[PDB]
């Protein structure tokens, strides 16, 4: 009987552990994807800032 209880508890524990790991990993992955995409857009804004800065360095000529 105690072995039966031990196996039920083991099943519950590892169900919980694997699900928690999966949800943590998914949160990390989606966060990294968004972050990469946000920083890419920011670098794009930067190139935009650079070129608009450049326009001011030719009119003074």
């Amino acid at each position: 009987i105690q072995k039966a209880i031990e196996e039920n508890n083991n099943f519950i524990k590892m169900a919980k552990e694997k699900l928690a790991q999966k949800m943590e990993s998914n949160k990390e992955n989606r966060e990294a994807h968004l972050a990469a995409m946000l920083e890419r857009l920011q670098e794009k804004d930067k190139h935009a800032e650079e070129v608009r800065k450049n326009k001011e360095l030719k009119e003074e000529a």
Partner: peptide
């Protein structure tokens, strides 16, 4: 699938 995992946790076998 998520609900089945969670129910396994909260209601055992």
């Amino acid at each position: 699938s998520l609900l089945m995992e969670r129910l396994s946790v909260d209601y055992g076998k």
